[PDB]
Coordinates of C-alpha atoms in Angstrom, one line a residue:
Chain A
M1 CA -5.8 0.7 -8.3
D2 CA -4.1 1.4 -11.3
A3 CA -1.5 -0.8 -9.9
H4 CA -3.8 -4.0 -10.5
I5 CA -4.8 -2.8 -14.0
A6 CA -1.3 -1.9 -14.6
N7 CA -0.6 -6.0 -13.7
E8 CA -3.4 -7.4 -15.5
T9 CA -2.3 -5.8 -18.3
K10 CA 1.4 -6.5 -18.0
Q11 CA 0.3 -10.4 -17.5
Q12 CA -2.7 -11.3 -20.3
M13 CA 0.1 -9.3 -23.0
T14 CA 3.1 -11.2 -21.9
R15 CA 1.9 -14.3 -20.1
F16 CA 4.2 -14.7 -17.7
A17 CA 2.6 -16.8 -15.0
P18 CA -0.9 -18.7 -15.7
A19 CA -3.0 -16.4 -13.6
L20 CA -3.2 -13.6 -11.3
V21 CA -4.8 -12.5 -7.6
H22 CA -5.1 -9.0 -6.5
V23 CA -4.5 -8.0 -3.1
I24 CA -4.3 -5.0 -0.9
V25 CA -1.7 -5.2 2.5
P26 CA -2.7 -3.1 5.0
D27 CA -0.7 -1.1 7.5
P28 CA -0.2 -3.2 10.3
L29 CA 1.2 -6.1 8.1
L30 CA 3.8 -4.3 6.6
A31 CA 4.7 -2.7 9.7
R32 CA 5.0 -5.8 11.5
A33 CA 6.8 -7.6 8.7
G34 CA 9.5 -5.1 9.8
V35 CA 9.2 -3.5 6.3
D36 CA 8.8 0.8 5.9
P37 CA 6.2 1.9 4.0
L38 CA 6.0 6.1 2.5
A39 CA 9.5 4.6 1.5
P40 CA 11.2 4.1 -2.1
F41 CA 9.2 0.8 -3.2
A42 CA 11.2 -2.0 -6.1
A43 CA 8.4 -5.1 -6.1
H44 CA 9.1 -8.5 -7.1
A45 CA 8.1 -12.3 -6.6
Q46 CA 8.6 -15.8 -7.3
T47 CA 6.2 -18.9 -7.0
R48 CA 8.2 -21.5 -5.3
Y49 CA 6.7 -25.1 -5.5
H50 CA 7.0 -27.1 -2.2
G51 CA 8.6 -30.9 -1.3
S52 CA 10.9 -30.0 -4.6
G53 CA 12.8 -26.5 -3.9
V54 CA 12.0 -25.2 -8.0
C55 CA 11.5 -21.4 -7.9
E56 CA 10.8 -19.5 -10.8
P57 CA 12.8 -16.5 -11.5
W58 CA 11.7 -13.2 -10.4
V59 CA 9.3 -11.3 -11.8
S60 CA 8.8 -7.7 -11.2
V61 CA 5.3 -6.1 -10.6
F62 CA 3.5 -2.5 -10.1
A63 CA 3.1 -1.6 -6.8
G64 CA 1.2 1.7 -5.4
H65 CA 1.6 2.2 -2.4
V66 CA -1.3 4.1 -1.5
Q67 CA -1.2 6.8 2.1
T68 CA -4.9 7.4 3.6
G69 CA -7.7 5.0 3.6
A70 CA -7.1 2.2 1.0
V71 CA -9.7 -0.5 1.1
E72 CA -12.8 3.2 0.7
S73 CA -10.3 4.1 -2.6
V74 CA -12.1 0.7 -4.3
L75 CA -15.4 1.9 -3.7
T76 CA -16.2 5.5 -3.7
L77 CA -15.5 8.6 -6.5
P78 CA -13.3 11.2 -5.8
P79 CA -15.4 14.1 -6.2
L80 CA -18.1 12.9 -4.2
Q81 CA -16.5 11.6 -0.8
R82 CA -12.9 12.0 1.1
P83 CA -11.8 7.9 1.8
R84 CA -10.9 7.2 5.3
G85 CA -9.1 4.7 7.5
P86 CA -5.3 2.8 6.9
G87 CA -3.7 2.5 4.0
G88 CA -1.5 -0.1 2.4
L89 CA 0.7 -1.1 -0.9
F90 CA -1.5 -2.5 -3.7
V91 CA -0.2 -5.5 -5.3
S92 CA -0.9 -8.4 -7.3
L93 CA 0.9 -11.7 -7.1
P94 CA 1.5 -14.3 -9.9
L95 CA 0.0 -18.2 -9.4
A96 CA 0.8 -21.6 -11.3
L97 CA -2.5 -23.7 -11.0
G98 CA -5.0 -24.6 -14.0
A99 CA -6.2 -27.9 -13.4
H100 CA -6.5 -28.4 -9.5
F101 CA -4.8 -25.8 -7.3
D102 CA -1.8 -27.1 -5.1
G103 CA -2.0 -26.6 -1.4
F104 CA 0.8 -25.4 0.7
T105 CA 2.9 -24.1 -2.4
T106 CA 3.7 -20.7 -1.4
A107 CA 4.1 -17.2 -3.7
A108 CA 6.4 -15.3 -2.3
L109 CA 6.5 -11.9 -2.3
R110 CA 9.7 -9.0 -1.8
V111 CA 10.1 -5.6 -1.2
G112 CA 12.9 -3.4 -0.5
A113 CA 14.5 -5.5 1.9
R114 CA 12.3 -8.5 2.9
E115 CA 10.3 -11.3 1.6
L116 CA 7.0 -12.1 2.9
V117 CA 5.0 -15.9 2.1
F118 CA 2.0 -16.7 1.2
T119 CA 0.6 -19.7 1.3
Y120 CA -2.1 -20.7 -1.5
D121 CA -4.4 -22.1 1.1
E122 CA -4.3 -19.0 2.0
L123 CA -4.4 -17.0 -1.0
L124 CA -7.3 -18.1 -2.8
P125 CA -10.6 -18.1 -1.2
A126 CA -13.6 -19.9 -2.5
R127 CA -16.3 -18.3 -2.6
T128 CA -16.7 -14.1 -3.2
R129 CA -19.2 -11.7 -1.6
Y130 CA -20.7 -9.9 -4.6
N131 CA -24.3 -9.4 -3.3
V132 CA -23.5 -6.5 -1.0
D133 CA -21.4 -4.6 -3.8
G134 CA -25.6 -3.7 -4.8
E135 CA -26.5 -2.7 -1.9
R136 CA -23.3 -0.4 -1.8
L137 CA -23.7 1.0 -5.7
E138 CA -27.3 2.2 -4.4
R139 CA -26.3 4.4 -2.3
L140 CA -23.6 5.6 -4.7
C141 CA -26.0 6.8 -7.4
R142 CA -28.2 8.5 -4.6
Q143 CA -25.2 10.0 -3.4
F144 CA -24.4 11.6 -7.1
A145 CA -27.9 12.4 -7.0
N146 CA -28.0 14.4 -3.7
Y147 CA -25.2 16.3 -4.7
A148 CA -25.9 17.7 -8.6
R149 CA -29.0 18.5 -6.8
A150 CA -28.1 20.8 -4.3
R151 CA -24.3 22.0 -5.8
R152 CA -26.0 23.5 -9.4
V153 CA -22.7 22.9 -11.2
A154 CA -23.6 21.8 -14.9
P155 CA -27.3 21.2 -17.2
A156 CA -26.3 17.8 -18.2
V157 CA -25.1 16.5 -15.3
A158 CA -28.2 18.5 -13.2
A159 CA -30.4 16.1 -15.8
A160 CA -29.4 13.3 -14.7
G161 CA -29.8 14.0 -11.5
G162 CA -33.1 14.7 -11.9
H163 CA -33.0 11.1 -13.5
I164 CA -31.6 9.0 -10.8
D165 CA -34.2 11.2 -8.1
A166 CA -37.2 10.3 -10.2
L167 CA -35.8 6.2 -10.3
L168 CA -35.3 5.6 -6.7
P169 CA -35.5 7.4 -3.4
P170 CA -33.5 10.4 -2.7
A171 CA -33.7 9.8 1.2
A172 CA -29.7 10.1 2.4
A173 CA -26.1 8.4 2.0
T174 CA -22.6 7.4 2.8
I175 CA -20.6 5.0 2.1
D176 CA -18.0 3.0 4.5
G177 CA -15.5 0.7 3.7
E178 CA -15.0 -0.7 7.1
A179 CA -18.9 -1.8 7.2
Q180 CA -18.3 -4.0 4.1
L181 CA -15.3 -6.8 6.0
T182 CA -18.1 -7.1 9.2
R183 CA -21.7 -6.8 8.0
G184 CA -21.3 -9.3 4.8
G185 CA -21.9 -12.5 4.4
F186 CA -20.1 -15.4 1.6
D187 CA -22.4 -15.8 -1.8
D188 CA -22.7 -19.0 -3.0
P189 CA -23.9 -20.3 -6.8
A190 CA -27.5 -21.4 -6.1
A191 CA -29.6 -18.9 -3.8
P192 CA -31.0 -17.1 -7.1
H193 CA -32.3 -20.9 -8.3
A194 CA -33.9 -21.0 -4.4
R195 CA -35.6 -18.4 -4.9
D196 CA -36.7 -19.2 -8.4
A197 CA -37.6 -22.6 -7.7
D198 CA -39.4 -21.3 -5.0
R199 CA -41.3 -18.8 -7.1
Chain B
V399 CA 13.1 -24.0 8.3
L400 CA 15.3 -23.6 5.3
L401 CA 16.7 -19.9 6.4
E402 CA 17.4 -21.2 10.2
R403 CA 19.2 -24.7 9.5
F404 CA 21.1 -22.0 6.7
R405 CA 22.0 -19.6 9.2
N406 CA 22.7 -22.3 11.8
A407 CA 25.2 -24.0 9.2
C408 CA 26.8 -20.2 9.0
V409 CA 27.0 -19.3 12.4
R410 CA 28.5 -23.2 13.2
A411 CA 31.4 -22.8 10.6
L412 CA 32.2 -19.1 11.7
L413 CA 32.1 -20.3 15.6
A414 CA 33.9 -23.2 14.8
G415 CA 36.6 -21.0 12.7
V416 CA 37.6 -18.7 16.1
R417 CA 37.3 -21.6 18.2
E418 CA 39.9 -23.5 16.7
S419 CA 42.1 -20.9 16.1
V420 CA 42.2 -19.6 19.4
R421 CA 41.9 -23.4 20.8
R422 CA 45.7 -23.6 21.4
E423 CA 46.8 -21.1 23.9
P424 CA 47.7 -17.8 22.3
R425 CA 48.8 -14.3 22.7
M426 CA 47.6 -12.2 19.4
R427 CA 49.6 -9.6 17.7
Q428 CA 47.9 -6.7 17.4
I429 CA 47.4 -7.0 13.3
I430 CA 46.4 -3.9 12.3
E431 CA 48.7 -0.3 12.7
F432 CA 46.8 2.3 15.5
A433 CA 49.4 4.2 18.2
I434 CA 48.3 4.4 21.4
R435 CA 48.5 7.3 23.5
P436 CA 50.7 6.4 26.6
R437 CA 48.1 7.4 28.9
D438 CA 45.7 4.6 27.1
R439 CA 48.2 1.2 28.8
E440 CA 45.0 0.9 31.5
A441 CA 42.5 0.9 28.8
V442 CA 44.6 -1.8 26.7
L443 CA 45.2 -3.8 30.0
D444 CA 41.7 -3.7 30.8
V445 CA 40.5 -5.0 27.0
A446 CA 43.2 -7.8 28.0
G447 CA 41.1 -8.4 30.6
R448 CA 37.4 -8.6 29.5
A449 CA 38.5 -10.4 25.9
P450 CA 37.2 -13.9 27.3
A451 CA 34.2 -13.0 28.9
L452 CA 33.6 -10.8 25.7
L453 CA 34.1 -13.5 23.0
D454 CA 31.7 -16.2 25.3
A455 CA 29.1 -13.2 25.3
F456 CA 29.6 -12.8 20.9
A457 CA 28.9 -16.3 20.5
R458 CA 26.1 -16.7 23.1
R459 CA 25.0 -13.7 21.1
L460 CA 25.4 -14.3 17.5
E461 CA 24.0 -18.1 18.5
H462 CA 20.7 -16.9 20.3
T463 CA 19.6 -14.6 17.5
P464 CA 16.9 -15.1 14.5
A465 CA 16.8 -15.8 11.3
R466 CA 15.5 -12.7 9.4
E467 CA 17.5 -10.1 11.3
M468 CA 20.8 -11.9 10.3
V469 CA 20.2 -12.5 6.2
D470 CA 21.2 -8.1 5.6
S471 CA 24.1 -8.6 8.0
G472 CA 27.2 -9.9 6.4
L473 CA 27.8 -13.6 7.5
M474 CA 25.5 -15.1 5.5
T475 CA 26.2 -12.1 2.6
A476 CA 29.7 -13.9 2.4
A477 CA 28.3 -16.9 2.8
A478 CA 26.1 -17.2 -0.2
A479 CA 28.8 -15.2 -1.6
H480 CA 30.6 -18.8 -1.5
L481 CA 28.0 -21.1 -1.9
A482 CA 27.7 -19.3 -5.7
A483 CA 30.9 -20.8 -6.7
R484 CA 30.3 -24.3 -6.7
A485 CA 26.3 -24.3 -7.3
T486 CA 27.4 -24.5 -11.4
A487 CA 24.3 -21.9 -12.1
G488 CA 25.3 -18.1 -12.4
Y489 CA 23.7 -15.8 -10.4
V490 CA 23.7 -12.3 -8.9
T491 CA 22.9 -10.1 -5.6
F492 CA 19.5 -7.8 -5.7
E493 CA 21.0 -4.8 -4.4
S494 CA 25.0 -5.0 -4.0
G495 CA 27.7 -5.1 -7.4
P496 CA 29.9 -8.4 -6.7
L497 CA 32.3 -8.8 -3.5
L498 CA 35.9 -9.4 -5.7
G499 CA 37.6 -11.1 -3.4
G500 CA 39.7 -9.6 -0.9
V501 CA 36.8 -7.2 0.0
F502 CA 36.4 -7.9 4.5
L503 CA 32.7 -7.6 5.2
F504 CA 32.3 -6.3 8.5
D505 CA 29.9 -6.5 11.6
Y506 CA 30.1 -4.9 14.1
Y507 CA 29.2 -5.5 17.8
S508 CA 29.0 -3.8 21.2
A509 CA 31.5 -4.4 23.9
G510 CA 30.3 -2.7 26.7
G511 CA 28.0 -4.8 29.0
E512 CA 24.9 -5.7 26.8
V513 CA 26.8 -7.3 23.4
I514 CA 24.7 -6.2 20.5
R515 CA 25.1 -5.7 16.9
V516 CA 25.2 -1.9 15.8
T517 CA 25.8 -1.6 12.3
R518 CA 22.2 -1.7 9.9
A519 CA 24.4 -1.8 7.1
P520 CA 27.7 -4.4 6.5
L521 CA 30.8 -2.4 6.1
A522 CA 33.5 -3.1 3.2
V523 CA 37.0 -2.6 4.1
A524 CA 39.6 -4.2 2.3
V525 CA 43.4 -5.5 3.8
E526 CA 46.1 -5.7 1.8
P527 CA 49.3 -7.0 3.8
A528 CA 51.5 -4.1 4.9
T529 CA 54.8 -3.7 7.2
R530 CA 56.2 -7.1 9.4
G531 CA 52.7 -8.4 9.1
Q532 CA 50.4 -6.2 9.9
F533 CA 47.5 -5.4 7.1
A534 CA 46.6 -2.4 6.0
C535 CA 42.7 -1.5 6.7
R536 CA 40.7 0.7 3.9
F537 CA 37.2 0.5 2.8
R538 CA 35.4 2.0 -0.1
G539 CA 31.3 1.5 -0.4
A540 CA 30.7 2.6 2.7
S541 CA 32.0 4.6 5.0
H542 CA 31.6 4.9 8.6
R543 CA 34.5 6.0 11.1
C544 CA 37.2 3.9 13.5
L545 CA 37.0 1.2 11.0
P546 CA 38.6 -2.0 12.6
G547 CA 39.5 -1.6 16.1
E548 CA 40.2 2.3 16.2
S549 CA 37.4 3.1 19.1
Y550 CA 36.7 1.2 21.5
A551 CA 32.8 -0.6 22.4
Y552 CA 33.6 -2.3 18.8
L553 CA 34.3 -6.0 18.4
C554 CA 34.6 -6.6 14.9
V555 CA 34.4 -9.3 12.6
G556 CA 34.4 -10.1 8.8
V557 CA 34.6 -13.0 6.6
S558 CA 35.8 -13.0 2.8
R559 CA 34.1 -14.1 -0.1
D560 CA 36.8 -16.7 0.1
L561 CA 35.8 -17.5 3.9
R562 CA 38.5 -15.7 5.7
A563 CA 37.7 -14.7 9.0
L564 CA 39.4 -12.0 10.9
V565 CA 38.6 -10.6 14.9
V566 CA 39.9 -7.5 16.0
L567 CA 39.3 -6.5 19.2
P568 CA 39.7 -2.8 20.6
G569 CA 43.2 -1.5 20.2
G570 CA 43.9 -3.5 16.7
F571 CA 44.6 -6.6 18.9
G572 CA 43.2 -10.0 17.0
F573 CA 43.8 -12.6 14.5
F574 CA 42.9 -14.4 11.3
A575 CA 40.7 -17.6 11.2
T576 CA 40.5 -20.1 8.2
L577 CA 37.0 -20.8 8.0
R578 CA 34.8 -24.4 6.5
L579 CA 31.0 -24.7 5.3
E580 CA 29.9 -27.9 6.1
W581 CA 26.4 -28.2 4.4
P582 CA 24.7 -30.4 1.8
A583 CA 25.2 -30.1 -2.0
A584 CA 21.2 -31.2 -2.9
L585 CA 20.5 -28.4 -1.5
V586 CA 22.4 -25.3 -3.0
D587 CA 20.6 -24.4 -5.7
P588 CA 17.7 -23.5 -3.5
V589 CA 18.8 -21.6 -1.2
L590 CA 20.5 -19.6 -4.1
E591 CA 17.5 -19.1 -6.0
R592 CA 16.0 -17.6 -2.5
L593 CA 19.7 -15.5 -2.0
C594 CA 20.3 -14.0 -5.9
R595 CA 18.4 -13.8 -8.8
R596 CA 19.9 -16.7 -11.6
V597 CA 20.1 -14.7 -14.7
Chain C
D247 CA 15.6 9.0 -49.9
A248 CA 19.1 10.8 -49.5
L249 CA 19.2 10.5 -46.5
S250 CA 17.3 7.6 -46.0
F251 CA 20.2 5.9 -47.3
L252 CA 22.7 8.4 -45.6
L253 CA 21.8 7.1 -41.9
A254 CA 20.7 3.6 -43.1
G255 CA 22.5 2.1 -40.1
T256 CA 20.7 4.6 -38.0
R257 CA 17.1 3.5 -39.0
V258 CA 18.2 -0.3 -39.0
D259 CA 19.0 -0.4 -35.4
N260 CA 16.4 2.0 -34.4
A261 CA 13.9 0.6 -35.8
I262 CA 14.6 -3.4 -34.1
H263 CA 16.0 -1.7 -30.8
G264 CA 12.4 0.9 -30.6
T265 CA 9.8 -0.9 -29.9
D266 CA 11.5 -2.3 -26.5
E267 CA 10.0 -2.1 -22.8
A268 CA 6.6 -2.2 -24.4
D269 CA 4.7 -5.7 -23.4
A270 CA 3.8 -7.0 -26.5
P271 CA 1.1 -9.6 -26.3
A272 CA 1.6 -13.7 -26.6
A273 CA 1.4 -14.9 -30.4
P274 CA -1.1 -13.0 -32.1
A275 CA -5.1 -14.9 -33.0
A276 CA -6.0 -16.4 -35.9
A277 CA -8.4 -14.5 -35.6
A278 CA -6.3 -10.9 -36.5
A279 CA -6.0 -12.1 -40.2
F280 CA -7.7 -10.2 -41.6
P281 CA -10.4 -12.0 -44.3
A282 CA -10.3 -10.9 -47.4
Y283 CA -11.2 -13.8 -49.7
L284 CA -15.5 -12.7 -48.6
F285 CA -16.1 -9.0 -50.3
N286 CA -16.7 -10.7 -53.3
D287 CA -18.3 -13.7 -52.0
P288 CA -22.5 -13.8 -54.0
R289 CA -23.5 -15.8 -51.4
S290 CA -22.2 -14.6 -47.9
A291 CA -24.0 -13.7 -44.4
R292 CA -24.7 -10.5 -44.7
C293 CA -26.0 -7.6 -42.6
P294 CA -28.2 -4.3 -43.9
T295 CA -27.4 -1.3 -41.7
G296 CA -29.8 -0.8 -38.5
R297 CA -30.0 -3.9 -37.7
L298 CA -26.8 -3.4 -35.6
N299 CA -27.0 -3.6 -31.6
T300 CA -27.6 -7.9 -30.8
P301 CA -30.1 -9.3 -33.2
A302 CA -29.8 -12.6 -34.8
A303 CA -26.8 -11.0 -36.8
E304 CA -24.3 -13.4 -35.1
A305 CA -22.7 -15.1 -37.8
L306 CA -20.5 -12.5 -39.2
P307 CA -17.2 -13.6 -38.4
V308 CA -15.0 -12.0 -35.8
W309 CA -11.8 -9.9 -36.7
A310 CA -10.2 -8.0 -33.5
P311 CA -7.0 -5.8 -35.1
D312 CA -4.8 -5.8 -32.3
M313 CA -1.7 -3.9 -32.5
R314 CA -0.2 -3.4 -28.9
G315 CA 3.7 -3.0 -29.0
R316 CA 4.3 -2.8 -32.3
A317 CA 6.9 0.0 -34.1
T318 CA 5.0 3.0 -34.7
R319 CA 6.2 6.0 -36.7
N320 CA 8.1 7.9 -33.6
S321 CA 9.4 4.1 -33.0
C322 CA 10.7 4.6 -36.3
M323 CA 12.0 8.9 -36.1
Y324 CA 15.7 8.8 -37.0
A325 CA 16.5 12.2 -38.3
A326 CA 15.0 15.4 -38.5
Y327 CA 15.9 18.4 -41.4
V328 CA 15.0 21.9 -41.6
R329 CA 16.4 24.0 -44.9
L330 CA 18.7 26.9 -43.9
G331 CA 19.4 28.7 -47.4
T332 CA 21.3 29.1 -50.7
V333 CA 25.2 28.7 -50.6
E334 CA 28.1 29.4 -53.6
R335 CA 31.2 27.8 -51.6
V336 CA 32.7 26.8 -48.6
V337 CA 36.3 26.9 -48.2
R338 CA 38.4 25.5 -44.6
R339 CA 40.5 27.7 -42.6
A340 CA 41.0 28.7 -39.7
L348 CA 40.6 25.7 -34.7
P349 CA 39.1 24.3 -37.6
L350 CA 36.5 26.1 -39.5
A351 CA 34.3 26.5 -42.6
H352 CA 33.2 30.0 -44.5
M353 CA 30.7 30.0 -46.0
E354 CA 30.1 32.3 -49.2
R355 CA 27.3 34.5 -50.2
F356 CA 24.8 32.6 -47.6
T357 CA 21.5 34.0 -48.3
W358 CA 19.2 33.3 -45.7
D359 CA 15.8 31.8 -46.2
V360 CA 14.3 29.5 -43.0
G361 CA 12.2 27.1 -43.8
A362 CA 9.1 24.2 -41.8
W363 CA 10.7 21.1 -40.0
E364 CA 10.2 18.3 -41.8
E365 CA 10.4 14.3 -40.4
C366 CA 12.7 11.5 -41.5
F367 CA 10.8 8.1 -40.3
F368 CA 10.7 5.9 -43.1
Chain D
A10 CA 51.5 14.3 20.8
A11 CA 54.4 11.7 21.5
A12 CA 52.5 8.4 21.4
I13 CA 53.7 4.6 21.6
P14 CA 54.2 3.7 17.9
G15 CA 52.2 0.6 15.8
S16 CA 54.3 -2.5 15.5
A17 CA 53.2 -6.4 15.8
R18 CA 55.9 -7.6 18.6
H19 CA 52.9 -5.5 20.6
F20 CA 50.7 -8.5 22.2
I21 CA 47.6 -8.9 24.6
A22 CA 47.5 -12.0 26.5
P23 CA 43.9 -12.6 27.8
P24 CA 43.5 -14.9 30.9
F25 CA 41.7 -18.0 29.9
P26 CA 39.9 -20.4 31.7
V27 CA 41.5 -23.7 30.4
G28 CA 38.4 -25.3 30.7
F29 CA 37.3 -22.4 27.9
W30 CA 37.0 -25.2 25.0
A31 CA 34.3 -27.6 25.8
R32 CA 31.3 -25.1 26.2
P33 CA 28.1 -28.2 26.3
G34 CA 26.3 -26.1 23.5
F35 CA 28.9 -24.8 21.8
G36 CA 29.7 -26.4 18.1
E37 CA 27.3 -29.2 18.2
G38 CA 24.1 -28.2 16.0
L39 CA 21.2 -26.1 17.2
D40 CA 18.7 -28.3 18.4
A41 CA 16.2 -25.5 20.5
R42 CA 16.4 -22.3 18.6
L43 CA 15.1 -24.5 15.3
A44 CA 12.9 -26.5 17.0
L45 CA 11.3 -23.5 19.1
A46 CA 10.9 -21.9 15.8
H47 CA 9.2 -24.3 14.2
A48 CA 7.0 -24.6 17.3
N49 CA 5.7 -21.2 17.4
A50 CA 5.4 -21.0 13.8
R51 CA 2.9 -23.9 13.2
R52 CA 1.1 -22.9 16.6
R53 CA 0.8 -19.5 14.4
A54 CA 0.0 -20.6 11.5
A55 CA -2.7 -23.0 12.4
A56 CA -4.1 -20.4 14.6
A57 CA -4.8 -18.4 11.8
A58 CA -6.1 -21.0 9.6
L59 CA -8.2 -22.1 11.8
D60 CA -9.4 -18.5 12.6
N61 CA -10.0 -18.0 8.3
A62 CA -11.9 -21.4 8.3
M63 CA -14.4 -20.3 11.1
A64 CA -14.9 -17.0 9.8
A65 CA -16.7 -19.1 6.6
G66 CA -18.2 -21.3 9.0
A67 CA -19.8 -18.6 10.5
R68 CA -23.1 -18.7 8.8
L69 CA -23.6 -22.5 9.3
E70 CA -27.4 -22.4 11.0
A71 CA -28.1 -19.5 9.4
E72 CA -27.7 -20.9 6.0
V73 CA -29.6 -24.4 7.5
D74 CA -32.2 -22.2 8.6
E75 CA -32.9 -19.8 5.8
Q76 CA -32.8 -23.3 3.6
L77 CA -36.2 -24.8 4.5
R78 CA -38.3 -21.5 4.7
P79 CA -40.4 -23.0 1.4
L80 CA -41.8 -25.8 3.3
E81 CA -43.8 -23.5 5.4
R82 CA -44.2 -21.9 2.4
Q83 CA -45.8 -25.2 1.0
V84 CA -48.3 -26.6 3.6
Chain E
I13 CA 54.7 9.5 16.7
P14 CA 54.8 10.3 13.4
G15 CA 53.5 10.1 9.5
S16 CA 50.0 11.6 10.6
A17 CA 48.6 8.6 11.4
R18 CA 45.2 6.9 13.4
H19 CA 45.0 6.8 17.0
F20 CA 43.4 4.4 19.2
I21 CA 40.4 6.6 20.5
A22 CA 40.1 5.6 24.3
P23 CA 36.8 5.6 27.0
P24 CA 36.7 9.4 27.5
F25 CA 35.9 8.6 31.2
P26 CA 37.9 6.7 33.6
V27 CA 38.3 3.3 32.7
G28 CA 36.3 2.0 35.8
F29 CA 32.6 3.3 34.2
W30 CA 32.5 0.8 31.5
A31 CA 31.0 -2.2 32.1
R32 CA 32.8 -6.0 31.8
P33 CA 30.6 -7.6 29.6
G34 CA 27.8 -10.1 29.4
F35 CA 24.5 -11.2 28.2
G36 CA 21.3 -11.2 30.0
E37 CA 18.8 -13.3 28.6
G38 CA 16.4 -15.7 30.7
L39 CA 14.7 -16.6 27.1
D40 CA 15.9 -20.7 28.2
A41 CA 15.7 -22.5 24.9
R42 CA 15.2 -26.5 26.2
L43 CA 12.4 -25.3 28.5
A44 CA 10.8 -23.6 25.7
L45 CA 10.1 -26.5 23.8
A46 CA 9.0 -28.6 26.8
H47 CA 6.2 -26.1 27.3
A48 CA 5.1 -25.4 23.8
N49 CA 5.3 -29.3 23.7

């Protein structure tokens, strides 16, 4: 996740592209692309418009390849649990947009030898999925509560554990990243207004 | 489509070159010095017997192969090095110093039964005119024994920055061959933006 | 000042090529200009202490001093010296050498030379 | 270690079939390969994009059913 | 003979035991287009 932060700062401070996008290419994709992980990386990228053949000069981006479960490394904190699952390199590609982001104009990625293409129409989804992260976060806080209650480490954290206890139920907890891609549905910006108008 | 068309053009060039150099009913002189032991007259006679089918299978193979596997090879490397001049704009490679014309980049091929490329990275050999029109081989940058035509089971092909190809059967027998690349001009800068850096 | 002038070329070419590889942002925002006209303004927006979280105090001007990639002191470091002692004479005489004369050892602390 | 020395006066004359030149698919700008590649690439990308769109569309009937729960409450 | 020169490495096994080259790929390019159509 440090890769995404580094790329965001390098983009905002210098403006080497209009906007950005965060991507987690997993293991089997890289494997079928002909590229191998666990080897020295050197990431680059360029944006190639369609129908003309004008390519902006390449730009180096910071990529960091995790080894064990990747998706959970975005969701969990170190001392409370360990991730699990497949793992691929984090990266962030540059874009070219601002008024009507054109379709069919790709964003070409470059790794040690091979190049991958990512059509805009494929990269940028309309609706996001922010409603399930509340369900994730409550479980995370309950997790920290049951840790602080049992491990008996320090008083300052014990007070916070007691507060969390008295705030929400202490039942149990576990965080699962794979379940995030399955269970959820896409969040739209209306439904709160539906509930409100029904109120 | 762009990469497939470019590769088709390069292969058409090379195959037409060897085609024209062999069209006239030839007798090929071993252009590289190699002392052959006196019991191996049988083996060079066998090379003589299998030269035609070997060249035919080589053409078939070099044609049918996909494009992702070819771009790292020396064929498209020297084709890009050739296009780099006429493009009227500067261009720098990614991971290799410029070719410094005079050096032939080799791509081997097996000579027994099934014909498959063996070399992962190209071999940077340098020809040098020697006694009685028999160019001397020597190679810096790579270190791979049996350089051209030294050992059996290695058909050796290589094209210079100036796009002049040679073919070295086992034992040292072969011929030079010129190359004429036929490709439009309205698309040169796209391909060179995708295969170089333009700095 | 003696070294600052002695090593002038070093300090010059060190202050400019020293910040390299640090992503500086784009042109600095006009909000970065620290407003000075507002100190001795009798009539101006004001806010007593004890009401600074998010009150109806939004009327204060914004100023974002943002310093990201400029030349820090360690960037302009060019020399460092330390006192060794006192000397009478230096003669040159032999591989070339330089014999001291009545050296009195008095070691001092280190010193920075950046400005 | 007595072996034959190498000099350019050595030649090797392979028996070529005099019809070796006019190989039909040879020299011609290769059609079927580029065409087949384009075909398969389109057919794979279309399946990918269809699966992507369906992944969002998998909530249509559910949204339509959810939207009208007030009109039961509104009587 | 002389000069510390290079030698042509011959097939270790007898000559009869290294196959005449070929190329076997039943994947035909034309009919593939006809089926994909």
